[PDB]
Amino acid sequence: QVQLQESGPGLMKPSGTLFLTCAVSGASISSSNWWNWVRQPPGKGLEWIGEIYHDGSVSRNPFLQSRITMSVDKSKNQFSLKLTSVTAADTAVYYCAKRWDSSGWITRHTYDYGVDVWGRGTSVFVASASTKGPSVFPLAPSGGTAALGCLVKDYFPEPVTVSWNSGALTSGVHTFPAVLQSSGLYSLSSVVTVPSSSLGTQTYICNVNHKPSNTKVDKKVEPK
Amino acid sequence: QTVVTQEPSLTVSPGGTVTLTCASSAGAVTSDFSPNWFLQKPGQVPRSLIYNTDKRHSWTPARFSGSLIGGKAALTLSGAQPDDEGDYYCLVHYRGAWVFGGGTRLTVLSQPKAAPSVTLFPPSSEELQANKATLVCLISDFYPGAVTVAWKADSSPVKAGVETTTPSKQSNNKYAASSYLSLTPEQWKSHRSYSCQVTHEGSTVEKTVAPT
Structure with missing residues (x-):
């Protein structure tokens, strides 16, 4: 042995x-x-x-x-x-x-x-790369349902938490694991499935928290 | 060193038989290559199975067997169990060096195959004023967790600026992945369209976005 x-x-x-x-x-x-x-x-x-x-x-x-x-x-x-x-x-x-x-x-x-x-x-x-805060970009919009999200781009290091509407929207949320780019930076995408008829009257906000850089972001996702 | 080639992914039912091959770019695989076979569970250290074509270690079960079949080193599994699921690599010796293969993702089907749902997002207007452009291709709800992603600008394949994750296990035992294509704002406007091709179990899904 x-x-x-x-x-x-x-x-x-x-x-x-x-x-x-x-x-x-x-x-x-x-x-x-x-x-x-x-x-x-x-x-x-x-x-x-x-x-x-x-x-x-x-x-x-x-x-x-x-x-x-x-x-x-x-x-x-x-x-x-x-x-x-x-x-x-x-x-x-x-x-x-x-x-x-x-x-x-x-x-x-x-x-x-x-x-x-x-x-x-x-x-x-x-x-x-050194410690870098994330750049949040909107992923603006399946018949009765629609998909919208937020692109958390170029951050470091790894720990990042994402919530929707201050944690109130939990059903239909899917956060993809981050990709490790060749530049040493991470990037992930969090998407939520919402009724397509509420896109004109309901607002959706993606909350990003990156403690290593002490950065918190709330991003409103518009229909665009 | 040569270029060792294995199957990207293969499937087998619980109790069935499957054979993984291991080819070389220099020609046929003789016993002088001394091919080895290793199995790596997700998150585990790779485990030795067969050394020198067809010799089992003290821990290799009798279900595994190796041989040389038509100029290729082959690993055969008889009576598939869900424990045998993992990534199989083959190691060969050539010109005084050991060369690993790309590996084969073997899945023991505990449930039928699931087709992926693909969503492709164009670059947002905020990123263009940041002088960047990123295409987000999201994949989810596919089983088994083996997929190939390709990008094309217009009618030409694209490989520069692509970065894709490996499949991760979801809560409902399915898998998900995502692919990104970083472009300059001028490249996003100098092409009529961009597409994300997703191939899974021989079936291909292609989404397309356009700047106009």
Whole structure:
């Protein structure tokens, strides 16, 4: 039962250097194993980074060789990963894993066995933008019912709460989860289903609260 | 590294059989690639299933099996259980490096398929005076939670300025997603129309807005 435990900074500034460590339990670094690193961008798939053997030999991702540096530490039973010139495109959940090394006749690097142990993952966010208040734009208008909403654009960080008519309108409200743009800013949309005959006599107001920027917005959605 | 290709999404009934493929852009997949298969539940750490074509780990159930079928590495599931639902990735070795595939979203249908309702909003007049323009394409009430969104200006496909979320589970066990197209005010006026194409289970829905 080999166990792995990675540790990271969590929050990182752009153009910096990412330094990750992975503690190995139940196994030694000097064993016949390849210590891998794998990351997964938000909403995307897995991406192999590289692996290192205890003798120093490494194998890196061809599109990231110049920015990847891996090392091992035998007195601490750990192996590390160093990524330089980090941008917002490197924001991902990073895992450390291991796989058994195989050989044929003499000691050799044959790749028969595969990955069998995974870590717990560590979140690394590259803050490409600072704290920014949200920009609320109206989404002005299904036969008997109509759809109207508010576009909460370009805010940071994540916590944002949206209500309609000071929380009085709760049926027919659907708040979509926010999208993480490449610029480091978030954006979501909250839409409500209302009777189409009341669009001329009933007013609807979308209440946005963004505590990290201490900004509260009430936006009236007109028929337009 | 090559370009590993998997199915975007596949479905299977509880107790049925399904096969996931794993292709390479360099040609046929021999045993020298040593293909591995991993399963990732939503929010969990990916779990190892098959290593080197057709070898199970101590925790892989007997329902899973791997092989090489017509130049592709294949993972076969017999007797589908709702626990097997997740994202399956294949890892192959080529030119001294490991390459992951795009992944396949496998859904074990606990209920019939649901079609999505799509609403497309044009840019508001307030945003144009802020010298910005954003198209909001909202998707909801679709099952399973696998969808493909594409944008077109006039008759030409659009990929620059597009950002889309992944499906999230609603309260009624359905899924929702949204896509955004950031444009300049001059681009919004230099085209006759913009559309949001939503493809789900082979059925496509396309909404269109126009500046005039």
